Design a protein around this nucleic acid. Structure first.
Lengths: 180, 124, 73, 262
RNA sequence: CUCUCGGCCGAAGCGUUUACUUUGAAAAAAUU
RNA sequence: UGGUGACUCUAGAUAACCUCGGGCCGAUCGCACGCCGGCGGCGACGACCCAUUCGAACGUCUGCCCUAUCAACUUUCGAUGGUAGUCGCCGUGCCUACCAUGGUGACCACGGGUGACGGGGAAUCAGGGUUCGAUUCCGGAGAGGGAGCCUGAGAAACGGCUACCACAUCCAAGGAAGGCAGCAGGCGCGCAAAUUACCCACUCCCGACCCGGGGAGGUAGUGACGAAAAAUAACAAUACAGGACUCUUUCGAGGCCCUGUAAUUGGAAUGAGUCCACUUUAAAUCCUUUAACGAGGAUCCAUUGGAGGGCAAGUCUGGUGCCAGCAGCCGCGGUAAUUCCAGCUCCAAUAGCGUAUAUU
RNA sequence: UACCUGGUUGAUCCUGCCAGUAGCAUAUGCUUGUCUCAAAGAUUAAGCCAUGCAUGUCUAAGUACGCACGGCCGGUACAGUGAAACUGCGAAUGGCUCAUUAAAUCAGUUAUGGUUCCUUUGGUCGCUCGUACUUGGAUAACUGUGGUAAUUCU
């Protein structure tokens, strides 16, 4: 015996049909629009939405005054409103079924850095996150698939130690300025 | 200059004769701050000599801001030598470990097991 | 394996002693020999020929004298 | 196996110790003692995991061998000593007395008590027998045997015992209309007034208990501890007064405390 | 659904018995 | 007297017994020392017996895969029951003696099989289901195979002993010593699996014990079993190119974005690496934090499978000529091969992707 | 995500299997920059094992006459630390494996009013009408003499 944990998850599912042109076109459209690395990012977002929809379906079969349904539905709807997918007015258990993949692809730090004008394309956003130029609140965030919470969105900034933030121009600028 | 010492959850252990605390270190440009001047800043903070205080477990967060470790301040150095683990005392040079390996003393133990009487003290 | 010490030398010797031996078939069907010592006595030095005494451990099959002997080179 | 077990894994430990999963392979095996191992606290878990005085089992041993821990008024230095229900823990150097009493979630609360209260405790009598030249004996839940008790004390009653002398001070009879805690089952840690018991001869008696908020429940008779006479208690109570809030009310109280303190 | 003992009620049988259904308490932790 | 739902219970009274292979009724140690020649305060070891805890052990009720090319089985040598005993920690055919003739079975007994340890659980799955569970938690079992025992609270113990069987070691030939299904390691076996490393610092365990010990366990090494995150570029100006807004009958004319080719330019931004130090830790390594160096495509160069259909992606060019080969399946190849071997090009997934097998 | 496509004919509609398709595991091939976790001699052979380690232990409080010690102050019985040894306790836990095993194990559910239990905790321990201001004999360690090729032999 070891004091180690063996619990783990696969965070995506591979589709049933390998070569279906409608799926291929739709997935490449999502990748090119949100600047994702591969199909597995699409499949991961699709897996997360499928799990949320399964939970909502399971809660809708329960009685409208059932305690479990009320409590778990309130938690589920609160979590969906907190990250910025649902809105406060549309916070009902049957409106979870009106959720698309592009709602969840909009809350990514890549998409938010591009939307805030910090980058000049979506691929520029992915690079600039990977370069450690973007902080959220006070923490430097290195992941582009970081889901931005709605309260967290109001201050996404340029990472004081970055060249585009506080200062200290980088390796190339230091080398080129040390020419003459 | 820019290095800051702040103290989170604080306890006075009267049973082990010490003050227990969590230290947050803010050092925005520099590396992880060495333990020695953490002990210096913590000595000026708490008005005690730095030879009775022990700090450990400092993990610098991603990005390069805070560093959180655990610290403790003893009432006296005698209580420190009575309560500290031996490795934290030896990091101050107040203790030394034996240089024999585990293998050497296992083999010596079984070789001594094979003999009887004060001939045990001869073999080794 | 890595070879730096005498303890690792003994470990390597212990490895080489206990191994699955690869058998080469051409060695196995014939009667081969490595020469540990060599002695020469000429029948006629002007002829530059004489009998040669090759001593070593036989390795292959049983060595019969009636069969010829090939020196490799 | 060939004889008694001496080890205990963390996974198979009781869940009310709130132990980790990745700190180790082993949990502190409680000693044999006045309480069952499933329903006690080893002294090491109390003295570092709840009170955070120590950080290792070594520091716990160092605290105990200085003789600063007293359990029921006697100095214990065993770090796995089983300290259980209604149990007074005295630390005289820091001058603080706790009692081990359950929470509503089934877990041993750290309940700080006044040192006047640290002089006595309550005990539920497990059996009564006459023996050895006609002398009556109580056996409580703490494996205390008390010779010469009051003849009105019957089984399942709660005696109050002062710890310095160890003898009976005053008792409460098991009666419908008396305050109780539940010491086992799903209702572990809930306090209410007994409304009914129904008797099943040759089996368990199920005792019905009504809360102060009117939520009725039932347990077995073996899981009932009488606390006070009527509706008032004889001991101090933890922060939640023995009522089990539903998870909706807990969420509401959590959010209200979030909104109040910002 | 009711005759006796105790304070309109508690004890005593219940009712041919079950099967079924609802509740309750018991059902390790890890896993889910 | 007290108690249970119920005693042949607990307590009481009487007459005796009381094992020499014998039962309790203290010839034991430490610390302070102190008061009316004597009394004493804490503690440590003790101890028969009652309870408590940790158990364990025999019982209760229900539940297990395949097989009838297994239909009757059990009882002479206990099979089912009665009576008395013996033995055992206790209840009991557990054994004995004497009796009775029972007990089980198509509601599948008895026999055989199982690539059978059982559960918690795992994979898959609309709903129902099928399959897996040697394997870290709980229970059992066993230490080469049987069998017997000593000691002890507890063992039919195997890092205890005694035999026999099978292996096998040292011998001066008389004798002596063995048990990795612990950790590491080796041989063998195979399609199939790691270091003869460091430490008791953590978790806990044992002991006369705050101190000793622990291949338990922890730490590194190996590690594409498998799971998570995530690089291999981004940008701007020019040159062609589309699609839009305005003005023009139209042609056209522009300042609006977008796009790649750039055998075009350009500086900015970075980690992979090299590497002080701090940090981490029992001591380290790694991660994290940090100085110095570190990027223009001939580099810091992405693979693996495919391109007739199923099934996304060429009727391109050379070779071959029912050959070599491909092709899960339908089929292709016999002189114009969309299928072989290649070159170019495209497609799919991607730090992964093919194949074999079991299984859903 | 409650899903199907190719193939029997001259063509058609069926039955129907074969093949494709997706997962999950075991092996294997080619390839492999970074980082966090992480299974790993189960399957065949519960086959066989060189070497080394895996179980020992002392407090003020069982027994100190090893100058083994710096060392008391000296007729101070025993200052103190203490090897060895005797005594006590533990070695029945943990670890490994899955051969056997089919109402057996095991799981839930109950019984001991049919038993035993080191330890811990509480009680009990002048409840007996019958040399003690302290009994006896040994034996280890140690000194010495040895045996056997050899053993944790004696």
């Amino acid at each position: 015996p070891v004091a180690r944990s063996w619990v783990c998850r696969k965070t995506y599912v591979t589709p049933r049909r390998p070569f279906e042109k409608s799926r291929l076109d739709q997935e490449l459209k999502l990748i090119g629009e949100y600047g994702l690395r591969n199909k597995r990012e699409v499949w991961r977002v699709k897996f997360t939405l499928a799990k949320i929809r399964k939970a909502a379906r399971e809660l809708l079969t329960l009685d409208e005054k059932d305690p479990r349904r009320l409590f778990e539905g309130n938690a589920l709807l609160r979590r969906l409103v907190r990250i910025g997918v649902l809105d406060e007015g549309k916070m009902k258990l049957d409106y979870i079924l009106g959720l698309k993949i592009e709602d969840f692809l909009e809350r990514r730090l890549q998409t938010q850095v591009f939307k805030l004008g910090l980058a000049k394309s979506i691929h520029h956003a992915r690079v600039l996150i990977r370069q450690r130029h973007i902080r959220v609140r006070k923490q430097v965030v290195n992941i582009p698939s970081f889901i931005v919470r709605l309260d967290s969105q109001k201050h996404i900034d340029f990472s004081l130690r970055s060249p585009y933030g506080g200062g200290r121009p980088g390796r190339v600028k230091r080398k080129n300025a040390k020419k003459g | 200059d820019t290095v800051t010492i702040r103290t989170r959850k604080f306890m006075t252990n009267r049973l082990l004769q010490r003050k227990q605390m969590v230290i947050d270190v803010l050092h925005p440009g520099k590396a992880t701050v060495p333990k020695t001047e953490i002990r210096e800043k913590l000595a000026k903070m708490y008005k005690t000599t730095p030879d009775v205080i022990f700090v450990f477990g400092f993990r610098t967060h991603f990005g390069g801001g805070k560093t959180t470790g655990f610290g403790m301040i003893y009432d006296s150095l005698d209580y420190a030598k009575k309560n500290e683990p031996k490795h934290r005392l030896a990091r101050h040079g107040l203790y030394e470990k034996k240089k024999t390996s585990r293998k050497q003393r296992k083999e010596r133990k079984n070789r001594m097991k094979k003999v009887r009487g004060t001939a045990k003290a001869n073999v080794g | 394996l890595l070879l730096d010490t005498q303890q690792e030398a003994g470990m390597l010797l212990r490895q080489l002693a206990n191994q699955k031996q690869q058998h080469l078939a051409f060695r196995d069907r014939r009667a081969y020999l490595f020469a540990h010592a060599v002695d020469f006595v000429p029948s006629e030095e002007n002829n530059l020929v004489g009998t040669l005494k090759i001593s070593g451990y036989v390795r292959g099959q049983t060595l019969n004298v009636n069969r010829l002997l090939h020196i490799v080179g | 196996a060939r004889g008694p077990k001496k080890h205990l894994k963390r996974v198979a430990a009781p869940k009310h110790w709130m132990l980790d999963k990745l700190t180790g392979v082993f949990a502190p095996r409680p000693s044999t003692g006045p309480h069952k191992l499933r329903e006690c606290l080893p002294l090491i878990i109390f003295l570092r995991n709840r009170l955070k005085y120590a950080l290792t089992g070594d520091e716990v041993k160092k605290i105990c061998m200085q003789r600063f821990i007293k359990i029921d008024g006697k100095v214990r230095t065993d770090i796995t000593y089983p300290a259980g229900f209604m149990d007074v823990i005295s630390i005289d150097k820091t001058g603080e007395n706790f009692r081990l009493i359950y929470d509503t979630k089934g877990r041993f609360a750290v309940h700080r008590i006044t040192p006047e209260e640290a002089k006595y405790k309550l005990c539920k009598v497990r059996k009564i027998f006459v023996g050895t030249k006609g002398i009556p004996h109580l056996v409580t839940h703490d494996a205390r045997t008390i010779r010469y008790p009051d003849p009105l004390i019957k089984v399942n009653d709660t005696i109050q015992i002062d710890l310095e002398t160890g003898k009976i001070t005053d008792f409460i009879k098991f009666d419908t209309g008396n305050l109780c805690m539940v010491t086992g089952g799903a209702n572990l840690g809930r306090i209410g007034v007994i409304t009914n018991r129904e008797r099943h001869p040759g089996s368990f008696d199920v005792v019905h208990v009504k809360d102060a908020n009117g939520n009725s429940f039932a347990t077995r008779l073996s899981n009932i501890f009488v606390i006070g006479k009527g509706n008032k208690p004889w001991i101090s109570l933890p922060r939640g007064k023995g009522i089990r809030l539903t998870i909706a009310e807990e969420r509401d109280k959590r959010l209200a405390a979030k909104q109040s303190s910002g």
